[PDB]
Structures are given as C-alpha cells and as structure tokens.
Ligand binder design. Structure first.
Ligand code: A1EFG
Ligand code: A1EFG
Length: 147
C-alpha cells in the first residue's frame, strides 16, 4: 500500500485522515510519496538527563528531563514546518551534537554504523524528508535526509 513504515491515521481535532510513519515518527496530511547502500543525513540532537553522556558543547551538565527535551524537539519541528526557522539554523544553534558546527551534517553512512533507531529512521526517510522525534541513547533527534 504505502512506503516502508507508513500507516493511515485520523486527526482527533479535525477528523481528517493523515499519514504517520512509525519508523521515522514523521506525520503529514498528504499521502506519502512511493534501499540505497548509503544515505546522508543531518540531525538536531537534544540531550537530556538520561542521555548516555549528559554533556555537550552547549552545556557541561545537561539536566533537562526527557519530557523537556521532547518539548524542545517538538517546538523545533513546529518552527521548521512553519518556515519560521530553518533546520540548519536550529541545528547550528541548539543541537547537543558536535555536528552542530556543520549545520548538523553527519555525512554519509551505511547500515550498521549508527545507533539502530537513528539508522532505521534515516533509511526510511526519502531524500529531502525530515523525521519526527527519534529516540536513541544519545537523546532525541530530528533527522533530515539530504542524499
Ligand atoms: C518524554 C517521552 O519519552 C518517550 C515518550 C514520551 C512522551 O511524552 O510521549
Ligand atoms: C504553539 C505551537 O506552535 C506550533 C504548534 C503549537 C501548538 O500549540 O501545538
């Protein structure tokens, strides 16, 4: 029926169908369009107090809760989707990853190199597509597949 990971859903507030991807946590109103050796992705990471390493270039001690980290992620997704902010700008300013200095770019990678939930979402994203919140042991990610 639909591309890998996509399922139909119903909006509670509007009653209109939408599409949700349970690998990427992406959600959208429009029917989704539709695997390579490698993909290229950028990401914005928000760490939290249960992150594997609760420290980043932004904060020596990361103390925010997972729930607070998800709230930040959700707010970034909202501003990216509205056009108020660009992914690359938010990643450079607010990603708790060293890749912030490269606007979130991680370069290209194969299966087997990244943390599984990140790998799975990356490879289920179509080129140009963005994930919803993706949880790993590092924190919560927004993933943008660029190639
Ligand atoms: C904070 C959090 O972690 C995993 C799920 C949630 C939620 O609030 O939905
Ligand atoms: C304040 C806001 O910005 C974007 C979405 C929302 C919301 O309330 O769901």
């Amino acid at each position: 029926k639909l591309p890998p990971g996509w399922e139909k859903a119903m909006s509670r507030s509007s009653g209109r169908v939408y599409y949700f991807n349970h690998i990427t946590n992406a959600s959208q109103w429009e029917r989704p369009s539709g695997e390579p050796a490698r993909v290229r992705c950028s990401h914005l990471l928000v760490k939290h107090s249960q992150s594997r390493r609760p420290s980043s270039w932004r904060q020596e001690k990361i103390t925010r809760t997972k729930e607070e980290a998800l709230e930040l992620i959700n707010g970034y997704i909202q501003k990216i989707k509205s056009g108020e902010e660009d992914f690359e700008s938010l990643a450079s300013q607010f990603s708790d990853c060293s890749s912030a200095k490269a606007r979130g770019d991680l370069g290209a990678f194969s299966r087997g190199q990244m943390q599984k939930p990140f790998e799975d979402a990356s490879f289920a994203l179509r080129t140009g597509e963005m994930s919803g919140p993706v949880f790993t042991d590092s924190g919560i990610h927004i993933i943008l597949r660029t190639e």
